């Protein structure tokens, strides 16, 4: 386990090195019983300036900034994400580019094992996250990690060559192994406990957003076509036809059994940082997607 | 697992963080075939500015420079010191005041390593001698009486630069030293009686060790002598442990240590080393005087 943080772009090695640095750093700060308010204003900044040392993959000079490290450690736990697992996802191999999953980010990436999405964002995106973080953390507590909201894992600032780049890490709305064949953006037939739980969450989530005074978020719907997933292959964890681990792929619903094609759907609220009144937007949102299901 | 770096003074917490960091960081850079010229001029530098985070033992703002990581990493291999032991001795618990020291030094909690605070000039002088010293440590296979250098750092904490060199303790990490002698310019000469194996070996080391310092044009260094009085240890500090025998030592751990002769006055352990390698007769003369001088104690 000699970790070369090797990537196609310098910026990605720096990311891989920072996540490795900050997670190790945190493995030495005790897990508190509660988070204090200080933790939401907090950060760690680290400037590196190597000289003739360890420069075969990293640049010789970079900064790395981790926003609110104690809070995102907690959120990781509440989302059932073990820190060492996060660390390995970002560090074992370089993050590889991904298709967009929102209007929010300027560049979308995935970790080699397709678990976590990494989004390049603006400084005002960083600041809006800081604005919503305590209530969001509160919300994630009250709801036990069971949202359709983006589930935030990390937030960073990297400087390479005097160029600053902000990044947010989330769990992938899509699968880590089933391909999403079609994405729909909404500003489908399932099981009844699925529909019930979906609409439970959706009301609870949309309510939250309205109370933060947020509008113009959308619903990302992705679709996995099983018959096509067989067919695009003809010419190690098991899994059958349209099967998935729901603790990993937490936005996935399988299509109803007595229903046409076997499909898997991925539904999540996206675009909560950058962008009728919000309460009105909330009520409309509920009702729009109530009709759309089963 | 869960290093808190609790030290009395923040410099020592920064030292413990720094070594932990730089050794970790080093496990991710591969052990190379050969040290290249740049390795003798390389360094690593890291600035930490934590805000309302991890302020428990660490300060918020601190900097940590390690000189020639790749030379000192190899040097440790050459001296039979695994990086994880090194990391362990420095990080498992705070470094502490040395029972002896200089004009004062630190030791790792386990008494295995000495950390001396030095000056900018010492740092510079070490940079001068380093390639040559490395060549030397290769040929002599880590079998020296010279200071065995393990790492070199500059910590900045609370506005203040501190340079540090880390060495293998001259003395035993377990056996008390009751009598110290320091043999300087042209001193405290009872003569020391050691085994045939031990005396033959010692004289062989000093021969090439003094040759080395000479060729580098280094003079004005001293021979440090420590004596562990075994019978005195058995009396004075009898059941200290419960509240290796009574003067028995691990040769791979205590590399300067020698046993008193089978047919000898009393039971004794000797520790002898050349010290003051960094900061007018000629050096080849000083070399010669020395080899001659320090052989006749035995």
Curated annotation (Swiss-Prot), chain A:
Domain PIPK: 7-293
Domain of life: Eukaryota
Pfam family name, one: PIP5K
Keywords: Acetylation, ATP-binding, Cell membrane, Cytoplasm, Endoplasmic reticulum, GTP-binding, Kinase, Lipid metabolism, Membrane, Nucleotide-binding, Nucleus, Phosphoprotein, Transferase, Ubl conjugation
Cross-referenced InterPro entries: PInositol-4-P-4/5-kinase_C_sf, PInositol-4-P-4/5-kinase_core, PInositol-4-P-5-kinase_N, PInositol-4/5-P-5/4-kinase
EC number: 2.7.1.149
GO cellular component entries: autophagosome; cytosol; endoplasmic reticulum membrane; nucleoplasm; nucleus; plasma membrane
Binding residue positions for ATP: 171-173, 183
Start and end residues of each stretch annotated as Required for interaction with PIP5K1A: 33-39
Membrane topology label: Peripheral membrane protein
Residues the record lists as N6-acetyllysine modifications: 63, 119
Summary of the tissues where the protein is detected: Highly expressed in brain, heart, pancreas, skeletal muscle and kidney. Detected at lower levels in placenta, lung and liver.
An MF annotation (GO) of this entry: 1-phosphatidylinositol-5-phosphate 4-kinase activity
Disulfide bonding pattern of the chain: none
Cell compartment(s), UniProt: Endoplasmic reticulum membrane; Cell membrane; Nucleus; Cytoplasm
Protein's GO biological process: 1-phosphatidyl-1D-myo-inositol 4,5-bisphosphate biosynthetic process; autophagosome-lysosome fusion; cell surface receptor signaling pathway; negative regulation of insulin receptor signaling pathway; phosphatidylinositol phosphate biosynthetic process; positive regulation of autophagosome assembly; regulation of autophagy
Subunit structure: Homodimer. Binds TNFRSF1A. Interacts with PIP4K2A; the interaction suppresses ubiquitination by the SPOP/CUL3 complex.
Purpose: Participates in the biosynthesis of phosphatidylinositol 4,5-bisphosphate. Preferentially utilizes GTP, rather than ATP, for PI(5)P phosphorylation and its activity reflects changes in direct proportion to the physiological GTP concentration. Its GTP-sensing activity is critical for metabolic adaptation. PIP4Ks negatively regulate insulin signaling through a catalytic-independent mechanism. They interact with PIP5Ks and suppress PIP5K-mediated PtdIns(4,5)P2 synthesis and insulin-dependent conversion to PtdIns(3,4,5)P3.
Protein name: Phosphatidylinositol 5-phosphate 4-kinase type-2 beta
Native source species: Homo sapiens
GN (gene name): PIP4K2B
């Amino acid at each position: 386990k000699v970790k070369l943080f090797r990537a196609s772009e310098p910026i990605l090695s720096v990311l891989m090195w920072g996540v490795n640095h900050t997670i190790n750093e945190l493995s030495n700060v005790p897990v508190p019983v509660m988070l204090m308010p200080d933790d939401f204003k907090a950060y760690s900044k680290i400037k590196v300036d190597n000289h003739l040392f360890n420069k075969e993959n990293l640049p010789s000079r970079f900064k790395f900034k981790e926003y609110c490290p104690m809070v995102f450690r907690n959120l990781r736990e509440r989302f059932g994400i073990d820190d060492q697992d996060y660390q390995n996802s970002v560090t074992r191999s370089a993050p590889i580019n991904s298709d967009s999953q929102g209007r929010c980010g300027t560049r979308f990436l995935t970790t080699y094992d397709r678990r976590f999405v990494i989004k390049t964002v603006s400084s005002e995106d960083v600041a809006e996250m800081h604005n919503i973080l305590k209530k969001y953390h509160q919300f994630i507590v009250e709801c036990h990690g069971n949202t359709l909201l983006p589930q935030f894992l990390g937030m960073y600032r990297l400087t390479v060559d005097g160029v600053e780049t902000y990044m947010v890490v989330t769990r992938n709305v899509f699968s880590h192994r089933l391909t999403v064949h079609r994405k729909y953006d909404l500003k489908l037939h399932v099981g009844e406990e699925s529909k019930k739980n979906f609409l439970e969450k959706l009301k609870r989530d949309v309510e939250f957003l309205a109370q933060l005074k947020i509008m113009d978020y959308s619903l990302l719907v992705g679709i996995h076509d099983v018959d096509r997933a067989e067919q695009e292959e003809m010419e190690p964890r098991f899994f059958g036809p349209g099967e998935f681990d729901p603790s990993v792929d937490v936005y996935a619903m399988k299509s109803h059994e007595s229903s046409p094609k076997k499909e898997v759907y991925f539904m999540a609220i996206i675009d909560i940082l950058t962008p009728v009144n919000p309460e009105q937007y909330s009520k409309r949102f509920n009702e729009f997607m109530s009709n759309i299901l089963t």
